[PDB]
Amino acid sequence: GLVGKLVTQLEVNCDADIFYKIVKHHEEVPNVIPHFFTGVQVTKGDGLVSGSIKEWNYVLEGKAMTAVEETTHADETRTLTHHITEGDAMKDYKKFDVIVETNPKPNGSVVTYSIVYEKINEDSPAPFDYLKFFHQNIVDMSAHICSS
Amino acid sequence: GLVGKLVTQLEVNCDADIFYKIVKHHEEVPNVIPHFFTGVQVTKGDGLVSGSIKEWNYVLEGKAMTAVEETTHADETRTLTHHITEGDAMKDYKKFDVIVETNPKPNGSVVTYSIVYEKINEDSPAPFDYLKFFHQNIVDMSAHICSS
């Protein structure tokens, strides 16, 4: 009950490496949803950007919220990670991390969004509201991509 | 968007084989939720029960629904499978299967409920309502188990 993971996995008709590069450089929130962020980019030492630290302001199921999150990526495994350190979600969770992976189908690709969480206590909900939000956002992004 | 999988994974403080035997023989719906089933048991040939075929009547998010499902199990892998063939969910999904796995932590156990689905069309929702229902049901079951 206290430690868990929620996952939404979707099949997309796109090469895994190409789709990963699309997800990596696209804002995961459509413009119709109220949101913006401020923050910084993170570099690795050679001066190239390797990630970001952002304070998001967004509206989820009608309620305005804030989150501070550090994003990192691993190109070799086509994995993006968002590590939330502060904000409304931290009233419910001791830990809240969002992991986005893209892999070729064993046969297009499979995209997996995982929310790895630890609740503050048993009265805390599991993050189904966030899972649906991330799901609908990635479906919206994928609906605007097509072949050729 | 059309083919996907939703997962809820929970850590439980229980031996994996013991917990699997508890899940295997317990009604996955608490009595406070309106529900009942009719149906049959399935045998493998030696006369021992290996599964069931049930017609469930239940109320989900206030709406009365029906499902026909065949349950099978694999003791060796501590896996239970519910294969839905008919009912309200089939108005939204061409395929709807619920897979419940229990495994020892690499360190208790990890219980995974997966809903493997294929939508009829793009207007169909993903089964977040079912994921939350199964999640809360397994949390309720686990809350009534303790050590010793």
Residue numbers in the entry:
A (entry chain A), B (entry chain A): 8 to 114, 117 to 157
What text appears in the publication on this structure?
Several proteins from plant pathogenesis-related family 10 (PR10) are highly abundant in the latex of opium poppy and have recently been shown to play diverse and important roles in the biosynthesis of benzylisoquinoline alkaloids (BIAs). PR10-10 has been proposed to act as a noncatalytic BIA binding protein. We observed that an intermolecular disulfide bond between Cys59 and Cys155 is formed in the apo structure, while the binding of alkaloid compounds to the central hydrophobic pocket induces conformational changes that prevent the formation of this intermolecular disulfide bond.
To decouple ligand binding from disulfide-bond formation, each of the two highly conserved cysteine residues (Cys59 and Cys155) in PR10-10 was replaced with serine using site-directed mutagenesis. Crystal structures of the Cys59Ser mutant were determined in the presence of papaverine and in the absence of exogenous BIA compounds. Attempts to crystallize the Cys59Ser and Cys155Ser mutants of PR10-10 in the absence of BIA ligands surprisingly yielded crystals with the morphology characteristic of PR10-10 with bound BIA ligands. Data processing confirms that these crystals show C2221 space-group symmetry, and structure determination and refinement reveal a closed cap-loop conformation similar to the structures of PR10-10 with bound BIA ligands. Instead, each mutant protein crystallized in a ligand-bound conformation in the absence of exogenous alkaloid, with the appearance of electron density in the ligand-binding site corresponding to an unknown small molecule that presumably copurified with each protein. However, the higher quality of the electron density in this region allowed the modeling of the whole cap loop in PR10-10-Cys59Ser with a bound unknown ligand. Residues 33–36 in the α1 helix unwind and adopt a nonhelical backbone conformation to close off the BIA binding pocket. Our new crystal structures, from which the full cap loop is modeled, reveal that the side chain of Glu35 points into the BIA binding pocket after the C-terminal end of the α1 helix. The key cap-loop residues Glu35 and Val36, which contribute to the BIA binding pocket in the holo form, are shifted ∼4 Å into the BIA binding pocket in PR10-10-Cys59Ser compared with wild-type holo PR10-10, thereby decreasing the size of the pocket. Structural alignments showed that the smaller BIA binding pocket in PR10-10-Cys59Ser does not provide sufficient space for papaverine binding, specifically the position of main and side chain of Val36. The cap loop appears to be capable of adopting different conformations to accommodate the binding of different-sized ligands.
